[PDB]
Amino acid sequence: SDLELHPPSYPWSHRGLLSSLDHTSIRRGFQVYKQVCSSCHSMDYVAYRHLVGVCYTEDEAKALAEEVEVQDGPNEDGEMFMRPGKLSDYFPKPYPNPEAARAANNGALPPDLSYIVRARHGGEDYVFSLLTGYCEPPTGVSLREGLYFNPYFPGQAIGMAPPIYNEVLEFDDGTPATMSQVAKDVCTFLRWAAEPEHDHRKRMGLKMLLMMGLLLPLVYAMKRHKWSVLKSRKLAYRPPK
């Protein structure tokens, strides 16, 4: 329907002005993307090298890349071939093209997630509410086959069946994989994926504030200094009577 339900505001640890992303959370969120979301959603603008120094070491990211096979070539015979992935490779696309994607999803197209957080009003609050917000259709609502009721999705009828649930995956750090925990980490990861400059911009923001905190009062003092000559000048009119 035309009614809208806006996501509430969650207290993300990166919500504050000077608050960085939680990198352990990004690490788990990537695992969620890797084990769950990647079978239907591409992440076209993220490569394995991007994970290095953010949530995985270079060696760990190299091992992750190697878990997959990517087409390369042509070789000397003009043939394309498969090889283990490497750091420079971008995350593998689940489908060759959006048509295949729709055909494999009852006509619906799983969007690319590289920017999903920035491409939706609500950002991670929206993705988190959507992911943990599936419920049964309200009385009087009947969805066509293939659609699921999700009160946070525009129109409330989404073509993605609930993708996460308790124990949908096992985390590398033992963290209890409840649905909400899984949603929170994947959302954190999606934020990073959409804005890898996130932590850096806030650190520069801190320096910018500190510099302006110094320079503004100093320049203002210079302004007042120069202008004092005009601010205290006195005028007298002495026409000959």
């Binding site: 640890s13 000077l18 608050s19 990198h23 320096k207 500190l210």
Partner: peptide
């Protein structure tokens, strides 16, 4: 001094969240 001081403040505000803070758990060269 400004850069180091600012970074320290930033890293303190974000204690345990940055890669530099959890990095040891995965390295060991």
């Amino acid at each position: 001094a400004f850069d180091q001081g600012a970074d320290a403040i930033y890293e303190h505000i974000n204690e345990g969240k940055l890669w530099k803070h959890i990095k040891h758990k995965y390295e060991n060269k």
